[PDB]
Amino acid sequence: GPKFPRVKNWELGSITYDTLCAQSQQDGPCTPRRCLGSLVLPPAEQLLSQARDFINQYYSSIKRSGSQAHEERLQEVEAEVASTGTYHLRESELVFGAKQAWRNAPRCVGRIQWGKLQVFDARDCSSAQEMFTYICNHIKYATNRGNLRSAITVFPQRAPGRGDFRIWNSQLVRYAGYRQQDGSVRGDPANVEITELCIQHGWTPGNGRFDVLPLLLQAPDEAPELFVLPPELVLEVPLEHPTLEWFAALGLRWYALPAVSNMLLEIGGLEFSAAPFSGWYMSTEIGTRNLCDPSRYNILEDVAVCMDLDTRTTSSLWKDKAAVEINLAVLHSFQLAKVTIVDHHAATVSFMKHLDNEQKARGGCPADWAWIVPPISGSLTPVFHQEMVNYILSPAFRYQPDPW
Amino acid sequence: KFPRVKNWELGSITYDTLCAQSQQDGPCTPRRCLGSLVLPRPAEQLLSQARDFINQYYSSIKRSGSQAHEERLQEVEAEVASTGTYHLRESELVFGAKQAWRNAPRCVGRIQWGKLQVFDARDCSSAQEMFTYICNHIKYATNRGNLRSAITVFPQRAPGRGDFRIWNSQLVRYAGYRQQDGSVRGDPANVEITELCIQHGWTPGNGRFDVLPLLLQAPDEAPELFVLPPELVLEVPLEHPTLEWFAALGLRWYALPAVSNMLLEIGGLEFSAAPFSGWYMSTEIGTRNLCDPSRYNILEDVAVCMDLDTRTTSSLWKDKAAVEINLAVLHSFQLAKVTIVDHHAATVSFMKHLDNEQKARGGCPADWAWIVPPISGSLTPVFHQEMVNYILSPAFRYQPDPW
Ligand code: HEM
Ligand code: HEM
Ligand SMILES: Cc1cc(N)nc(CCc2cc(N)cc(CCc3cc(C)cc(N)n3)c2)c1
Ligand SMILES: Cc1cc(N)nc(CCc2cc(N)cc(CCc3cc(C)cc(N)n3)c2)c1
Ligand SMILES: C[C@H](O)[C@H](O)[C@H]1CNc2nc(N)[nH]c(=O)c2N1
Ligand SMILES: C[C@H](O)[C@H](O)[C@H]1CNc2nc(N)[nH]c(=O)c2N1
Ligand SMILES: [Zn+2]
C-alpha cells in the first residue's frame, strides 16, 4: 500500500490515507518508543525559510504557484528580512493565514466554518486604550445581538527586543473567582490568580458567583492597564430547564461569546501574541466542562439532589443523569434567547463532514482525538470512531506563557 | 527525555521511568502522532527476550543472581541453542500471564492483576481436549456469578507448523444472521463468523440472542465445531428499576467477557490461543454493544418508548436514552447477582492502580482514549489524568484471522 498513515472509520468501515502530515515541518511529543497524545502541555536562518514556506502556501490558495507575482513577493521578503530582520504581512495574506491557522488547530471541532471568519486588522494599534476599543469593536461585531459571528482581531507582532502586546486574561469573558478565608472559592475558580491580579492592579471587586471580569491589557514595555467592559455590551444567558421547573431557580448563567485571548498566533514566522478570536459555544463546554468539573463551578451534586437522586451510591448513575440535564438546560436556555449554540452531536456530525472536505482538498486533517470527541456521550457521536492523525502545521496557534 | 505527567483535577505531577523499559515500537513518531489508531500495520534475539523475561521472574520473587536463576537461565540457553527455542516452567507462565494483563495499556480493570487464575493447557493435542479446557475455564470463571479473573494457555507456537487457534473472538458470543434485505438479525459484528460455523456444519437458530458454537483449531486441522453446554453460560435478562415497560424489550446479555483471539506473548514465546475472562464494566454492555450503530443499535428504539423527540439532536435523546440503557444494565446484574462494575467505581479504582504502579514499577502505561469510558467521560478522574502509552513485555498482541 501507500507509505503514509492509514485511517479507518470503524462505523462506516471506510479508509483514508493522510498525505498532509508529509508537510508537518514541526516535531511533536511522541517518539516511536512512546505516545504522549494525552499530554496537554507539550534569527535569519529559520525565519527566512519559515516565511518562504507561508508565501508558497499563499500563492497556492490563489493558484498562482511559481509565477512572477510569486518570486517577486519572495524577494520582497528576502529584501525586508535581510536588511531589517523582519517583514510585514500584506493584509490579504494575514487574512488567508489567520484562516489557515483555525483550519490547522487540531484540537477544534469547530472547523467546518474555518473559511467563514472575519479578520479585523488591528496592526496599527498603539496604546492600551486603542487596544480596548478595538476589542469592544470585536465583541459588538461578533456578538451581534445573538446571531454570533466568527472573528479575530490582530494586534502587532513581536519585535526584536521591544515590548510584547498582551491581553493578560485568557478570555475576553471570564467570571471572577474569589478565594475564601475557608479555602472554597466564590465564583469560577478557573481564574482566581487573575481575579487576584485584577484587584491588586486597581479593581474594586464584587461579592458574586458570576461577577464579570474586567480586562487586563498591556502595550509594549508599558505597565499593564485595566479596562472594564460596558455591561449592556456583555451578553449573558439565564439558564432554565424545559421540564424541571426548579432549574431556573438555581440562578445559574453563562455568557454568549467564547473569546480566546491568551494565545499566540504564528504565521510565516511572525508572532501575534495578542490576537484574540471567538466563535460560539458547543453546549457541552458550558454544561460539562465549566459547570460540572469539580475543579470549576462543579454544581452536579447540587443539581442531583434537587433531582432526587441517590448519591450515596456511585452506581445509581446520578453523576451522569444530572449532567445530561445540565447540558440540556444549557441548550434549551440558548435556543430560547435566540443565541447561537450547537450541541455535541450536531457539532461532531459536521466536523465529520469537514474531515471529508479536507480529505479531497489537502489530503487529511490533523486531529487530537481526545479533544475532538466530546466530554459526554463520546461513543454516540460519529467522530468517536474516526481514527485521527495529529500533527503540527503552520500557521498555527501556540499556547503561550502568562505575562507575569 | 523522561515524561512529566500532570493530573489536572488535583495538580498531581509525576514522572514515568517505566517507559524506558519499552522494547518494541509504536506507530507514533515525532512528525505525526497516531496514538488513536486501533491496530498496527535471528534466534539469538529470542534468546535475549528470554533472559530479559526470565529476569523479570527471579527478580520478581527476589532471587535474581542466586542459584536457581543462574541455573535456570542456562536450561534456557541450552535449550534455545539446540531446539531453536525453549519452554516455560509453569509458575513462570503464571508470572508471565499476570504481568501481561498488568501491562496491556488498554485495560481499565488492571487493579485486579494480582488476582488471576492460570490454567496450563500446554499439554493439549486436539480440539476435543481444547473444548474441555474451555468448558472447564468458563465453569470456573462464571462461578455462579462471583466472577473470577482467569486465563487459559494452550500450546505455544511451533516454528514451521500450524497454530492452536480459537476462531471465535470471544467465548460466549451472539449469532448474527444476515437477511436478504441487507438486514441483520442479532449481533452484526459476528455476521461473518456465524456463516463460518454454518459452512463448517452448524444448525442456526433465528432468535436475536443465540450463543454461537465454538470453532477450535489445532495445528493444520480444518477447525471443528463444538457446542457450549446450554448452562455453562450465564445470561442476564435486562430490566430498568423504575421503567416498568423496559424488559418487555426482551433484551439480555451474557455474564462472561472472554477473549479468544489475542496472542499472549511471554518472554520470546507466542501463545496463539490463550482465552481470558474477568468481568464486565457496564458501559461495554450498554454503550458499545447495545447502542453502537455498527451493532445491536437499540438507541432510537429505547428513546421512542422513553417518549422523546427523535426529530432533533438538541433534545439530547440519544444521551438521555443511553443513560437508561446503562442504568438497566447495572440494575439487572446486581439483581441477577452477577459481578459488574460501573465506569465510575472502575475508573476510580484504576486511578488508584495508577498510584500503585507509580510507587511500584515507577510508572505504568495506559491508552487514554481507551481507558476513558465512552459515556460521560469527563465525569471520571481518568479523563483529567494524562497518561503515557508504551509497549512492555510480556503482553497481548492482536493476530490475523486464521483465514
Ligand atoms: C465556530 C464555532 C466554534 C466551535 C463550535 C468551536 C469549538 C471548539 C471546542 C469544543 C474546542 C475544544 C476546547 C475545550 O473544550 O477545551 C475547540 C478548540 C479550539 N478551537 Fe474552536 N470552536 C469554534 C470556533 C473557533 C474559532 C473562531 C477559532 C479561532 C480562529 C477556534 C480555534 C480553536 C483553538 C485554537 C482550539 C484549541 C486551542 C487550545 O488548546 O486552547 N475555534 N473549539
Ligand atoms: C477483571 C475485570 C476487568 C475489567 C473491569 C476490565 C475492563 C476492560 C475494558 C472495559 C476494556 C476495554 C474494551 C472496550 O472498551 O471495548 C479492557 C481492555 C482490555 N483488557 Fe480488561 N478488564 C478486566 C479484566 C481483564 C483481564 C482478566 C484481562 C486479561 C488477563 C484483561 C485484559 C485486557 C486486554 C488485553 C484489553 C485490550 C485489548 C483489546 O484491544 O481487546 N482485562 N479491559
Ligand atoms: C491551564 C490551561 C491553560 C491554557 N492556556 N489552556 C488550557 C486548556 C483549556 C482551554 C483554555 C482556554 N482559554 C480556551 C479553551 C478553548 C475554548 C473555546 C474556544 C473557541 C474559539 C470556541 C469554543 N467553542 N471554545 C480551552 C488549560
Ligand atoms: C483484532 C480485533 C478483532 C476484533 N473482533 N475486535 C477488536 C477490538 C477490541 C476488543 C476485542 C474483544 N474481543 C473484546 C474487547 C473487550 C475486552 C474486555 C475483556 C475483559 C476480560 C473485560 C472487559 N471489560 N473487556 C475489545 C480487535
Ligand atoms: C487530561 C486530558 O488529556 C485533558 O484534560 C484534555 C482531554 N480532552 C479535552 N477535550 C476538550 N474538549 N477540552 C479539554 O480541556 C480537554 N482536556
Ligand atoms: C478510534 C478509537 O481509537 C477507537 O474507537 C477506540 C476509542 N475508545 C474506545 N473506548 C472503548 N471503551 N472501547 C473501544 O473499543 C474504543 N475504541
Ligand atoms: Zn502519540
PDB file of N, CA and C in Angstrom, chain A residues 237-242 247 252 326-339 341:
ATOM      1  N   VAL A 237     -26.796  34.710  29.332  1.00  0.00           N
ATOM      2  CA  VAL A 237     -27.995  33.945  29.166  1.00  0.00           C
ATOM      3  C   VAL A 237     -28.316  33.385  30.559  1.00  0.00           C
ATOM      4  N   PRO A 238     -29.522  33.703  31.137  1.00  0.00           N
ATOM      5  CA  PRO A 238     -30.015  32.977  32.333  1.00  0.00           C
ATOM      6  C   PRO A 238     -30.281  31.558  31.924  1.00  0.00           C
ATOM      7  N   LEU A 239     -30.157  30.614  32.849  1.00  0.00           N
ATOM      8  CA  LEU A 239     -30.356  29.229  32.464  1.00  0.00           C
ATOM      9  C   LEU A 239     -31.650  28.649  32.977  1.00  0.00           C
ATOM     10  N   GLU A 240     -32.336  27.907  32.126  1.00  0.00           N
ATOM     11  CA  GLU A 240     -33.521  27.165  32.565  1.00  0.00           C
ATOM     12  C   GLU A 240     -33.747  25.831  31.868  1.00  0.00           C
ATOM     13  N   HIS A 241     -34.621  25.031  32.463  1.00  0.00           N
ATOM     14  CA  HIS A 241     -34.827  23.669  32.006  1.00  0.00           C
ATOM     15  C   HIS A 241     -36.257  23.481  31.487  1.00  0.00           C
ATOM     16  N   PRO A 242     -36.409  22.989  30.236  1.00  0.00           N
ATOM     17  CA  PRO A 242     -37.739  22.882  29.659  1.00  0.00           C
ATOM     18  C   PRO A 242     -38.733  22.313  30.677  1.00  0.00           C
ATOM     19  N   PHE A 247     -35.033  24.447  37.912  1.00  0.00           N
ATOM     20  CA  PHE A 247     -33.706  24.748  37.452  1.00  0.00           C
ATOM     21  C   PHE A 247     -33.449  26.247  37.367  1.00  0.00           C
ATOM     22  N   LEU A 252     -28.498  30.111  37.795  1.00  0.00           N
ATOM     23  CA  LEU A 252     -27.290  29.899  37.022  1.00  0.00           C
ATOM     24  C   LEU A 252     -27.291  30.701  35.723  1.00  0.00           C
ATOM     25  N   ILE A 326     -28.180  19.106  32.841  1.00  0.00           N
ATOM     26  CA  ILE A 326     -27.395  20.375  32.784  1.00  0.00           C
ATOM     27  C   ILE A 326     -27.220  20.909  31.350  1.00  0.00           C
ATOM     28  N   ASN A 327     -26.417  20.216  30.539  1.00  0.00           N
ATOM     29  CA  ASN A 327     -26.336  20.465  29.093  1.00  0.00           C
ATOM     30  C   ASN A 327     -27.670  20.818  28.434  1.00  0.00           C
ATOM     31  N   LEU A 328     -28.694  19.989  28.662  1.00  0.00           N
ATOM     32  CA  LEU A 328     -29.971  20.231  28.045  1.00  0.00           C
ATOM     33  C   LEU A 328     -30.437  21.603  28.470  1.00  0.00           C
ATOM     34  N   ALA A 329     -30.327  21.913  29.747  1.00  0.00           N
ATOM     35  CA  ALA A 329     -30.702  23.262  30.141  1.00  0.00           C
ATOM     36  C   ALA A 329     -29.733  24.332  29.564  1.00  0.00           C
ATOM     37  N   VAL A 330     -28.492  23.935  29.260  1.00  0.00           N
ATOM     38  CA  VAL A 330     -27.574  24.856  28.612  1.00  0.00           C
ATOM     39  C   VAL A 330     -28.124  25.119  27.228  1.00  0.00           C
ATOM     40  N   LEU A 331     -28.316  24.042  26.453  1.00  0.00           N
ATOM     41  CA  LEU A 331     -29.012  24.088  25.140  1.00  0.00           C
ATOM     42  C   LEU A 331     -30.351  24.847  25.123  1.00  0.00           C
ATOM     43  N   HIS A 332     -31.309  24.419  25.936  1.00  0.00           N
ATOM     44  CA  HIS A 332     -32.636  24.982  25.836  1.00  0.00           C
ATOM     45  C   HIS A 332     -32.611  26.456  26.153  1.00  0.00           C
ATOM     46  N   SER A 333     -31.790  26.837  27.113  1.00  0.00           N
ATOM     47  CA  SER A 333     -31.733  28.233  27.509  1.00  0.00           C
ATOM     48  C   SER A 333     -31.210  29.067  26.343  1.00  0.00           C
ATOM     49  N   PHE A 334     -30.274  28.518  25.587  1.00  0.00           N
ATOM     50  CA  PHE A 334     -29.720  29.267  24.475  1.00  0.00           C
ATOM     51  C   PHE A 334     -30.680  29.359  23.302  1.00  0.00           C
ATOM     52  N   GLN A 335     -31.222  28.201  22.922  1.00  0.00           N
ATOM     53  CA  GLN A 335     -32.158  28.088  21.803  1.00  0.00           C
ATOM     54  C   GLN A 335     -33.181  29.175  21.966  1.00  0.00           C
ATOM     55  N   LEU A 336     -33.494  29.437  23.238  1.00  0.00           N
ATOM     56  CA  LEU A 336     -34.633  30.261  23.662  1.00  0.00           C
ATOM     57  C   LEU A 336     -34.365  31.770  23.838  1.00  0.00           C
ATOM     58  N   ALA A 337     -33.105  32.168  23.928  1.00  0.00           N
ATOM     59  CA  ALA A 337     -32.783  33.591  23.884  1.00  0.00           C
ATOM     60  C   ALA A 337     -32.459  33.952  22.444  1.00  0.00           C
ATOM     61  N   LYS A 338     -32.586  32.978  21.535  1.00  0.00           N
ATOM     62  CA  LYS A 338     -32.247  33.186  20.131  1.00  0.00           C
ATOM     63  C   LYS A 338     -30.784  33.609  20.129  1.00  0.00           C
ATOM     64  N   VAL A 339     -29.949  32.752  20.736  1.00  0.00           N
ATOM     65  CA  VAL A 339     -28.494  32.915  20.825  1.00  0.00           C
ATOM     66  C   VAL A 339     -27.790  31.664  20.244  1.00  0.00           C
ATOM     67  N   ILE A 341     -25.827  28.554  19.549  1.00  0.00           N
ATOM     68  CA  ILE A 341     -25.287  27.393  20.241  1.00  0.00           C
ATOM     69  C   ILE A 341     -25.306  26.251  19.259  1.00  0.00           C
TER      70      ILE A 341
END
